[PDB]
Design a protein around this ligand. Structure first.
Ligand SMILES: Cc1cc(OCCCc2c(C(=O)NS(=O)(=O)c3ccc(C(=O)O)o3)[nH]c3c(-c4c(C)n[nH]c4C)c(Cl)ccc23)cc(C)c1Cl
Length: 155
């Protein structure tokens, strides 16, 4: 995970940043590269799906969390660790984790707090890897992520 954390962080960062700014992740990924780009495209189609089907839940949880500044951001990781670390692990739960990540980043930009997007990203990444590296390793990681969701809605 001196590379699974970094690659995970690369996907999650670029995803949250493009969801927050509406600007597309140009500039290269740096290893494994294509794996990461294709994961990001997947994350767009799948993560858009999760936000559309869960808008009421997402809106309600974002409001209950009441996020105004980065000091809130440092205390979110412990709510997020608490919620995500119990129960079965599956790719659907990981994409929900990240999608609500994006949701929060869009909020952060709306209240002019873009700066917290990076810490938020890192926090998501740490929670995911800290808690699931083994699972992620034996689902063949982000290549496993690309294939399981095999985009057959865009072709
Ligand atoms: C960035 C961030 C991410 C977070 O993710 C938390 C765990 C991620 C999650 C879950 C989860 O896992 N649900 S699960 O075990 O039924 C599941 C999802 C997919 C599968 C499967 O296919 O199998 O199963 N549910 C969440 C909901 C929520 C929903 C969707 N309906 N009602 C509610 C409340 C909200 Cl609003 C936000 C985050 C989550 C949590 C926090 C606090 C933050 Cl800040």
């Amino acid at each position: 995970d001196d590379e699974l954390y970094r690659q995970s962080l690369e996907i999650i960062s670029r995803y949250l940043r493009e969801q927050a700014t509406g600007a597309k992740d140009t500039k290269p990924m740096g290893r494994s590269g294509a794996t990461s780009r294709k994961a990001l495209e997947t994350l767009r189609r799948v993560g858009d799906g999760v936000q559309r089907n869960h808008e009421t839940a997402f809106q309600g949880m974002l409001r209950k969390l009441d996020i105004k500044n980065e000091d809130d951001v440092k205390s979110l990781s412990r709510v997020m660790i608490h919620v995500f670390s119990d129960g079965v692990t599956n790719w659907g739960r990981i994409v929900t984790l990240i999608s609500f990540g994006a949701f929060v980043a869009k909020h952060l930009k709306t209240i002019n707090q873009e700066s917290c997007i990076e810490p938020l990203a890192e926090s998501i990444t740490d929670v995911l890897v800290r808690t699931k590296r083994d699972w992620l390793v034996k689902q063949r990681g982000w290549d496993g992520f690309v294939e399981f969701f095999h985009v057959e809605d865009l072709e």
